[PDB]
Amino acid sequence: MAAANPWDPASAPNGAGLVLGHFIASGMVNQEMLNMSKKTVSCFVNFTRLQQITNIQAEIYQKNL
Amino acid sequence: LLTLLSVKMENNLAEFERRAEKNLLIMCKEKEKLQKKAHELKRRLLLSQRK
Amino acid sequence: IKRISGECGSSFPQVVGSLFLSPGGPKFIHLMYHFARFVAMKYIKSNSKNSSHHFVETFNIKPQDLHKCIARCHFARSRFLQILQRQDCVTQKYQENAQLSVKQVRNLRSECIGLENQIKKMEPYDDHSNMEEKIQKVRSLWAS
Amino acid sequence: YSEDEGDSSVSRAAVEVFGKLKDLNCPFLEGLYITEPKTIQELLCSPSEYRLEILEWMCTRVWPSLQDRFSSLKGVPTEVKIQEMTKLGHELMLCAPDDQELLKGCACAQKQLHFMDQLLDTIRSLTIGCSSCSSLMEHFEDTREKNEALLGELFSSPHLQMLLNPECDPWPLDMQPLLNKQSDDWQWASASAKSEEEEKLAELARQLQESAAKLHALRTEYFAQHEQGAAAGAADIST
Numbered sequence: 001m002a003a004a005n006p007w008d009p010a011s012a013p014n015g016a017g018l019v020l021g022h023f024i025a026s027g028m029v030n031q032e033m034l035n036m037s038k039k040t041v042s043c044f045v046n047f048t049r050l051q052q053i054t055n056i057q058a059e060i061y062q063k064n065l
Numbered sequence: 066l067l068t069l070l071s072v073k074m075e076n077n078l079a080e081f082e083r084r085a086e087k088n089l090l091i092m093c094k095e096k097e098k099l100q101k102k103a104h105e106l107k108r109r110l111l112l113s114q115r116k
Numbered sequence: 117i118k119r120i121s122g123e124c125g126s127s128f129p130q131v132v133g134s135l136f137l138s139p140g141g142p143k144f145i146h147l148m149y150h151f152a153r154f155v156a157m158k159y160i161k162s163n164s165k166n167s168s169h170h171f172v173e174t175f176n177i178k179p180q181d182l183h184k185c186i187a188r189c190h191f192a193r194s195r196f197l198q199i200l201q202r203q204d205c206v207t208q209k210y211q212e213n214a215q216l217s218v219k220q221v222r223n224l225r226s227e228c229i230g231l232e233n234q235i236k237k238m239e240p241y242d243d244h245s246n247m248e249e250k251i252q253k254v255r256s257l258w259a260s
Numbered sequence: 261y262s263e264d265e266g267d268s269s270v271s272r273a274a275v276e277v278f279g280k281l282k283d284l285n286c287p288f289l290e291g292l293y294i295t296e297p298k299t300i301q302e303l304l305c306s307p308s309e310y311r312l313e314i315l316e317w318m319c320t321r322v323w324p325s326l327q328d329r330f331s332s333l334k335g336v337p338t339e340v341k342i343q344e345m346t347k348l349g350h351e352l353m354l355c356a357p358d359d360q361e362l363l364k365g366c367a368c369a370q371k372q373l374h375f376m377d378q379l380l381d382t383i384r385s386l387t388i389g390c391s392s393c394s395s396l397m398e399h400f401e402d403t404r405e406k407n408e409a410l411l412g413e414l415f416s417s418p419h420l421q422m423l424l425n426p427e428c429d430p431w432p433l434d435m436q437p438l439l440n441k442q443s444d445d446w447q448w449a450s451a452s453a454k455s456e457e458e459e460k461l462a463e464l465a466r467q468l469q470e471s472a473a474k475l476h477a478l479r480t481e482y483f484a485q486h487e488q489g490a491a492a493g494a495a496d497i498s499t
Contacts, residue, residue, distance in 0.1 A: 012211050012430050015422040016204035019414075026413065028406060029197075033388075037198055043082070043206055044213065046450075047089045049457045054097050056464055061104045063471055065111070066411060067192035068171075069156055072163050073424070074199055078206070081426040085210050087446060088428060088439070092217055095438055099224045106231035116244055167353075174351040183323055186400060188352060190385040191378065193407070207426070214430045221435075 117151070127178070128154065262458065270369045271297035274304060277373060280380060286314070305372055307365020315376075319345065322383065354378070 004010070023029055042048070117131045128150055135144050161172055179185050278300045282289065292310070294300055304311050320327045326344070330336065342363040349355045349362075354375065361367050362375065393399035483490075 014204060014207045014211075015419060016200055016207060018419070019417075019423075020200070020204065023413065028410065033197075034201060036384075037194075037201055038205075039198070039202070041202075043209065044086070044089065046086060046453065046457065047093060047213065049461060050090065050093050053457070053461060053464060054093065054100065056468055057097075058100060060464070060468060060471060061100075063468075063475060065108065067189075067196045068160055071192070071195055071199055072160055074203060075166070076163065077424065077426055078199075078203055081428065082206070084428045087450070089210075089213065089217070090450075091439060091442070091446060092221070092435075096217065096221060096224070099221065099228065103224055103228050103231070106228060106235070110231060110234065113239060116247065168356060170350065170356050171353045173357075174353060177351075182396065182400065184351065186389075186396075186403065187322075187382055187386060189403070189407070190389070191352065191382050194378070194381055194385060203426075210428075211430060218431070218435075 120151070120154070124154070125176075127176075261455070266370070267298075267301075270305070270373065271301050273370075273373050274300040277304060277376070281314070286317075288313070288317070301369060304376075305365075305369035311365070315345070316341065318383070319348070322386070323348075349375075352382075 020029070020034075024031070121128050121131065129143075129147060131147060135141075135147055157172075157175060161169060164171070275297050278295070294303060326348075339360070342360050345363050346355060346360045347357060349359070350357050355362060362372060389399050389403060390396075393402055
């Protein structure tokens with residue numbers, strides 16, 4: 001009985017991802033018309049900037065040591 | 066129908082990103098505090114060691 | 117409903133009290149449908165933040181041109197698919213950031229608790245107070 | 261107060277704009293292979309006659325009645341086409357009735373580029389609609405059928421309560437008290453934090469640079485008086 005990992009199960013099911021997976025299988029949508037719709041904007045900009053700042057302070061503390 | 070869907074998903078995305086940004090920055094702050102006291106623990110350990 | 121019909125115009129069908137007293141028939145469904153997408157469009161006017169509120173003078177005109185209607189419907193479908201995939205990507209970005217932050221916090225307090233446990237344990241001696249002072253005598257020995 | 265990234269991003273966006281124009285193989289593609297990003301930016305964002313020519317030929321292609329009113333009623337000022345194109349953009353739910361500063365060319369680069377981006381997206385959508393369908397009637401009927409099928413399949417599931425309510429709970433059970441300790445100490449820090457975050461980013465990257473420089477300098481100074489003992493370090497400490 002090799003059950004799934006309680007701390008690493010299947011990932012958190014997004015409703016958008018699940019409906020896109022089940023509706024690609026419908027055949028109306030395919031991969032390619034999603035592909036040029038894959039616009040990449042930078043979100044979490046406060047989070048990403050503060051995270052790289054904290055990373056930088058980690059090696060500042062290290063380098064000082 | 067498409068316009069109503071777009072507007073209500075826009076509002077849901079707005080509240081979602083507000084909650085997500087607030088929570089993520091709070092855990093980033095406690096990340097910073099944890100590594101600060103952790104760095105204090107390393108410097109104390111190495112200091113006492115080479116004494 | 118008569119104040120609404122006065123504000124809007126004559127495209128909204130006439131409302132009879134027979135519909136009120138006898139809620140049935142295809143005309144009753146017709147009137148509910150009309151007032152339903154009217155109040156939906158009113159909500160769209162009320163809640164269009166990032167986009168301009170100029171769509172109300174587009175949707176009140178009786179549609180006449182096929183090419184324009186097809187293009188506008190295709191644009192609306194493209195907007196829905198675009199916001200759908202963007203919301204999806206934001207969701208997985210939040211998920212991966214959440215799990216990486218959780219793992220980093222786990223590693224941090226693991227090494228933390230290790231550090232104060234060794235701080236409790238591996239220090240049974242402490243005579244640092246003379247240390248620098250003895251170093252003085254040390255160089256004196258070397259000087260000698 | 262930082263516009264360095266914006267011009268570069270507009271230039272790159274103009275690069276895929278020029279690529280997307282090259283993909284469709286316009287009949288007037290001959291003679292102008294402009295590829296430098298800022299030249300493409302000042303060509304398709306500053307007021308130029310070539311961009312207006314491309315847009316008017318496209319609008320002739322997509323809808324014939326404007327060219328009917330052109331040829332049947334010749335003798336029309338350019339600003340009349342400008343306001344007509346602004347109007348046809350307006351009931352595309354895209355711009356205001358008086359946003360003729362867009363079609364004049366003097367408008368700012370980013371939203372003109374974005375505007376023509378959804379414009380070319382609609383062009384792509386109508387082209388792939390008309391590719392598999394011979395006539396406008398058949399394309400319209402097939403679009404109606406596929407759209408009613410789509411709206412039928414969206415609202416046939418009980419899982420949309422996650423869609424209407426995007427949850428924020430991937431966290432375990434031992435982390436929420438850390439939130440609740442300082443749950444009321446955040447509402448003021450999110451006011452004007454962008455300039456603050458970027459200025460700590462700049463000065464802390466600077467501090468990283470000079471800290472690396474000083475540690476390298478100190479290590480080289482230590483190794484200056486070490487190379488006479490670098491070869492002599494083979495002797496063991498305990499021996």
